[PDB]
Amino acid sequence: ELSQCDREPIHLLGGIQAYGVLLAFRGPDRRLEVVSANTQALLGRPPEALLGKTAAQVLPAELWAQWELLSARGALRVALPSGPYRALLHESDGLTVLELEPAELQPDMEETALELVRRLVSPLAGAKGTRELLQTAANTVRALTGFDRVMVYRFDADWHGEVLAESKREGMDGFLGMHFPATDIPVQARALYTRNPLRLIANARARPVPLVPSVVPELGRPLDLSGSALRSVSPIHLEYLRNMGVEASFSLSLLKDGALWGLIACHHLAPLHLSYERRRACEVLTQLLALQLSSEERAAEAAEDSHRAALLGPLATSLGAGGTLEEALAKDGARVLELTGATGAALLLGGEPLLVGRTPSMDEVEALAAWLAPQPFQTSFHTERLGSLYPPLAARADVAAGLLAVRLAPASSRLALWFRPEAVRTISWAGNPRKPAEPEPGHARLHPRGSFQAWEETVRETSPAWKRADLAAAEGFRSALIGVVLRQAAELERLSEALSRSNAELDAFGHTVAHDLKEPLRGIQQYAGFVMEDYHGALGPEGRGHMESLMWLAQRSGDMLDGLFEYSRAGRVDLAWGEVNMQEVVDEVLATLSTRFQAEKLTVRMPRRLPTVRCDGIRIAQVWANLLVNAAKYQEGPERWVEAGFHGPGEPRPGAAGRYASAYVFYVKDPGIGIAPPFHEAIFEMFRRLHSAKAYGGGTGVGLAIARRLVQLHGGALWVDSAPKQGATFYFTLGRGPG
Amino acid sequence: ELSQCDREPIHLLGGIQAYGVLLAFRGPDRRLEVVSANTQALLGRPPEALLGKTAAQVLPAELWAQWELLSARGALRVALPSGPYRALLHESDGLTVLELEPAELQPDMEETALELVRRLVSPLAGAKGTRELLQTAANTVRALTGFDRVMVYRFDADWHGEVLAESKREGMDGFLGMHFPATDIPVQARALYTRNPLRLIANARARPVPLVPSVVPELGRPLDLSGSALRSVSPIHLEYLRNMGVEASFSLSLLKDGALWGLIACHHLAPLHLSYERRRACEVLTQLLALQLSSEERAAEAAEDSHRAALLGPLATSLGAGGTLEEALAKDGARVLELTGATGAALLLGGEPLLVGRTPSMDEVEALAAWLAPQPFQTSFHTERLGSLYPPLAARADVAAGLLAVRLAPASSRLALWFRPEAVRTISWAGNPRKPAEPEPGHARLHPRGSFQAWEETVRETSPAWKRADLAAAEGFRSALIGVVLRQAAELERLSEALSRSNAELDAFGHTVAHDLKEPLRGIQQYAGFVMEDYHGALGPEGRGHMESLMWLAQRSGDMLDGLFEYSRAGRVDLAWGEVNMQEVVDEVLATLSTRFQAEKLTVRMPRRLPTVRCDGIRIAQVWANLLVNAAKYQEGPERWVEAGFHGPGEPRPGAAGRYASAYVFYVKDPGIGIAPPFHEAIFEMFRRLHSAKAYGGGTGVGLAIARRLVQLHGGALWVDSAPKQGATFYFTLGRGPG
Ligand SMILES: */C=C/C1=C(C)C(=O)N/C1=C\C1=NC(=C\c2[nH]c(/C=C3/NC(=O)C(C=C)=C3C)c(C)c2CCC(=O)O)/C(CCC(=O)O)=C1C
Numbered sequence A, B: 001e002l003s004q005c006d007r008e009p010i011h012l013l014g015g016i017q018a019y020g021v022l023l024a025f026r027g028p029d030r031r032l033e034v035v036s037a038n039t040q041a042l043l044g045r046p047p048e049a050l051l052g053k054t055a056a057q058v059l060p061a062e063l064w065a066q067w068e069l070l071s072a073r074g075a076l077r078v079a080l081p082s083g084p085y086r087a088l089l090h091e092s093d094g095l096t097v098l099e100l101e102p103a104e105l106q107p108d109m110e111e112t113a114l115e116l117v118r119r120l121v122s123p124l125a126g127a128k129g130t131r132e133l134l135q136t137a138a139n140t141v142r143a144l145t146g147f148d149r150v151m152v153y154r155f156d157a158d159w160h161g162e163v164l165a166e167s168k169r170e171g172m173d174g175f176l177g178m179h180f181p182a183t184d185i186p187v188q189a190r191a192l193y194t195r196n197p198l199r200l201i202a203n204a205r206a207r208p209v210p211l212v213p214s215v216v217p218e219l220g221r222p223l224d225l226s227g228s229a230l231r232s233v234s235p236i237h238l239e240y241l242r243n244m245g246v247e248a249s250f251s252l253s254l255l256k257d258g259a260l261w262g263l264i265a266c267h268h269l270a271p272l273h274l275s276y277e278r279r280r281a282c283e284v285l286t287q288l289l290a291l292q293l294s295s296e297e298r299a300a301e302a303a304e305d306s307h308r309a310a311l312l313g314p315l316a317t318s319l320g321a322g323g324t325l326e327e328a329l330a331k332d333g334a335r336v337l338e339l340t341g342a343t344g345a346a347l348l349l350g351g352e353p354l355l356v357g358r359t360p361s362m363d364e365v366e367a368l369a370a371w372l373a374p375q376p377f378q379t380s381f382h383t384e385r386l387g388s389l390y391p392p393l394a395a396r397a398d399v400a401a402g403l404l405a406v407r408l409a410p411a412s413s414r415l416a417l418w419f420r421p422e423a424v425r426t427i428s429w430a431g432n433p434r435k436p437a438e439p440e441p442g443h444a445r446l447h448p449r450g451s452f453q454a455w456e457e458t459v460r461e462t463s464p465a466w467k468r469a470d471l472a473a474a475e476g477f478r479s480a481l482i483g484v485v486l487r488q489a490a491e492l493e494r495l496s497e498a499l500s501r502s503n504a505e506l507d508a509f510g511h512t513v514a515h516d517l518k519e520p521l522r523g524i525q526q527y528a529g530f531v532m533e534d535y536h537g538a539l540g541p542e543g544r545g546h547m548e549s550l551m552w553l554a555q556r557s558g559d560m561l562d563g564l565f566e567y568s569r570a571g572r573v574d575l576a577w578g579e580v581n582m583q584e585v586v587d588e589v590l591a592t593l594s595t596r597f598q599a600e601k602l603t604v605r606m607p608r609r610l611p612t613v614r615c616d617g618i619r620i621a622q623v624w625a626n627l628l629v630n631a632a633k634y635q636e637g638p639e640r641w642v643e644a645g646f647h648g649p650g651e652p653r654p655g656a657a658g659r660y661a662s663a664y665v666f667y668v669k670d671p672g673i674g675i676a677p678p679f680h681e682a683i684f685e686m687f688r689r690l691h692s693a694k695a696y697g698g699g700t701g702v703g704l705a706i707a708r709r710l711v712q713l714h715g716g717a718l719w720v721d722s723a724p725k726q727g728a729t730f731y732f733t734l735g736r737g738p739g
């Protein structure tokens, strides 16, 4: 920036303060080439003639008594006929630089300075907070320097700083709680202050002392004074101080690590000068303060992050505990809002967005959801001034001041949204930030602000800035728990509803079968009616036989259709508790399956007749037929047979049949392949088989389910004792029935 | 060797090191009550003869001049004819103790006070964590004082000592990693170290100087010396140092909120002296170190807890994705252990125990799991020592010294538990560097192999205490991982049986349509054979017609079955292409639905003649019938008329019909209520009706799905344009079919 401020060079102005004396040396010869003009008082010779001559006779002889140890160390206190002076040496631009300053006069303060500086570390420090540290540091600085006003200036990320602590004298004007514009500190000053910890300005009204010669012959520019301590500041800042009304200034820099955290500023109303040892004490004070501040801020950040993680966890615990995703989220919307300190939570799981708290209206929320897809961000996005970037939503910015968005899915429209409310803030400036300076004709300079009276700027459509902890919480919300639980909850809900539609379709199919089953009955009645009753004689023998075959085929088809309707259909399957001979039903089932038994080489074994029990004959016959079909379907042994019997009251029974102490336990045993004992309860399920569907001469697996349902409806249960290559025995328990 | 060690007092030894001088005063007149034996050299008078003598006479007038200043400040440097002599003053027990020590010969202008503070503090600009803080502090202290060895000791929970950081001169043995029992530093020593922050032993070989009189006349005990800094040392510690071969000692205490935390010890092989400025700087150094340590420990604990919480992140992310809990444990066996910092994880989820890392044998694990059940604990159990409580595992405590268990099932014996070995194999050996020295003392006091052996016996079969962070992490695991895995297993079983139910429903539909095609394969055959049964006019025409009617009914029944084959599934039939006129299909549909149109007062409108398209006649007729039924179902207007038209290639058509760029688009328009544009696609779903199922004379919601499926199978798509109270128009696009 080549504008009045940044364009002005520093550390090359060549201005020297009044009281100092400056000398330069180079090479082993150590001659004089850069000397100030105010040395005539000390040296007693024309400084212009003193340039280049033998230094061995220029400076007073008393200095050479400790010259070597001063060069070894860098600081020296020496008595002169004019008075006791302080001397420092430093190598700048490849040349030795010597300074002479009016030294201190009271030799009784240096020891007390240790006691004074001990007050910052203190028996008590930080027990009440960082504010205590700052105010104690300011008070100690003020007591040490003897100045009037001492303030602490903390820089911001935008390089416009504030003041935190303050120490005052009676009658002065305080500057607590004001914001100064970032233009007050140019880049050159920030660059310089990373290397020179402190500086002093004794007299604002004093004209800077020129340096002779004007420029260095081998450089063409005045010698750098960055490492020195007597450089005069640019007159623009002098005018700034004069307009402020102060007289003398003295500042130190707080370095966190290569970064200017802040300054310690001191002002005065009269000319005043400080000793070297006092400045060293203040430097040590700043060192200690910087150490403590860095440690405390690190601890605070770590504690905040740990607290946010330990708040993230319980959300996962609570979500896992519950079983109603939307309702569980609603009943603890405060927790998710506090997760990042927001007021509106919005969830996008591919369906209707979920809204909690102060949230934008629906139209706005899918307007935003449509957006943020064109905007490229790798994982997440966040902003405070949404209305500026998004004019459409700037209208109702009260509930949509600022936002944060996280890509819930890896790459989709599933986004999590946090909305902040409008926060009203006002800030004070010592002067008008809009006009940091007044231009002058020629644009060679920009005069500083004429006044620094309080001016109020009120911001609108703003919310507190996002903290790093908020970003960490959002990132830990995207994945690393909480994300897994809500992803799986959404999958669970959106597929459980699909399964609900699935059994709804199953019920619809059942109702369709129920209302269509009236057609086979009507067709069978029509086929039976008007035939074989009036035209039976006219049909002849062959006609009557063909009609009988047709009627038998129709009846068989109707019976098969009725049996296939094993579901609920129009009427749920039930049992009629009646005195029906179980032996007769078993014999009828065997006669019906006699052809299958002969084809499968299965012999019906009846060691004893099944006792009669109070149960439906049709249901008992169906259960027996299903059990026989299941036993003979997976029968591979050459000796295939089915043994049917029953254990009554007190009759011996195997362990599996003895599980239920029913009055009657009908057992059918076959020496087939059988099923695994774990699969014995599995085969009883609907359409469950231990072999391939197309194997064992085809199968459906619904017979075992029908038998189990019949047993359950009869007050008992069906248990199959089956072992690998050891045969199978299915026992069904018959209860007393309804009473 | 003396057992009277932890009880013997250090205050009342009545001894002062060789170089110092001590006087005691009492009363307003400041009489003499306690003096040392070195007063003869510095005063030139008999020691005991000065007791009870007036203060002004005995003490030289030089320190009398500064006596009030000495009382005010507390310390003062004063030159005496013999030489410089620093004076200290403090009130011990109602007796004012004055302290004279030989000040160093330096003229105090080499490295004055408050200057060493900067030298010590400057290298502490970094010090990211806590260990490097102590390391750098020890290094810079050894650089400043120049002592041979510097060590840092940290105290354990029960005052066990551990060497943390060592900064040593090259040449001697290193003691980094030591461990000594609490008995090596008695209670009185700890109290003294807490009280004052400095301790210095100038010479180990110096004989202590006695105190005359041997006891105070009044209190009956030797004068207190805790407040002072020249009290003698116990002979046992002198023997300790002599065996160690250490001459002078310098120790700085470390505090934390008033509780002792560690020590900084300095050892030298020869007597040495320290300037008082260095000591006065070291005091401030200790204060600053305590202030730093508090925040550093807080931040370290917070960061450790945060990392423990975040470790659940990747572990949870391992779940959810395809894998088993045991599988994740097997590959992530590494990450699990540092969740509690153990060497072995065991868990009993319901099957055989799972063991990862270092753990006892499986049978012992099962026995321990059985033994845990009687012990009453709600959720968490944990011991640092197991042999004291579990005798069976006491012998093999080397790998199972301590344990931490948490139950998984609320009531059942499902628990997960981490094992930690004894705190003697974890610690790296440091105590016995071999090369034993030539002297061989009793070595019960000699640290080499003397200590670190009692400590081994004191802590054998014991694990480091379960830190609160580890317990919190274990609780978080038990909560979150179980609350995730339970619903993960629920999801697994749920979609398993959902897929099973869907495929079983499809297979049952296929089997049922097979059965309901085989049944009419006999029914229609019987109906046809009934005609040939008569084979003559004997049956008569009318009766024969009845048979014909039955045949038609049979055919109708078959048609119904065919309808079922096209009802539940999308098409359940192979696609075909044929030259079937769309106008003929529309006319046939209108004629079939003529009764329905007359009953519902529906008028068939034909704005244009439907051309001929390459599509199946049956499929086109079914699609048209479904569209007409859907249009007439939701028709509530008085002038309810259905208009059927066709748009060819390049002809004007509605935008919805223009979605599919097909040659022909057949559109059916009705003035009924229609469906919402969002519900236009939802209505196309099978069994999806926007109104009540029983409303509008019943409904199924499968005709639109069938039409959409036919359109999709015909190389096109089916669209519906409808708005609330704006009619509806269903357009089906017909493609060119296969090439
Ligand atoms: C009968 C009691 C004691 C036995 C036990 C013993 O060995 N020392 C006993 C009393 C005191 N020890 C004091 C100082 C001290 N001792 C240790 C022990 C150590 N453990 C180690 O590993 C090492 C080094 C290898 C040592 C030296 C320490 C660490 C200390 C403090 C360090 C120091 O001040 O030098 C003591 C106080 C003496 C005093 O007045 O200063 C007593 C009493």
Ligand SMILES: */C=C\C1=C(C)C(=O)N/C1=C\C1=NC(=C\c2[nH]c(/C=C3\NC(=O)C(C=C)=C3C)c(C)c2CCC(=O)O)/C(CCC(=O)O)=C1C
Pocket (backbone or CB within 6 Å): A004, A005, A006, A008, A010, A151, A152, A153, A180, A183, A184, A185, A186, A188, A189, A199, A232, A233, A234, A236, A237, A240, A249, A250, A251, A263, A265, A436, A437, A446, A447, A448, A449
């Ligand atoms: C481009 C012109 C210009 C405008 C006017 C302006 O505000 N500053 C400026 C140029 C320079 N000012 C320099 C020095 C300087 N300014 C400040 C500002 C403050 N004084 C306070 O009391 C205070 C509060 C707290 C603030 C923010 C300060 C602190 C300085 C440093 C000098 C002091 O120690 O006071 C400057 C660099 C010259 C130099 O410092 O050597 C330029 C170029």
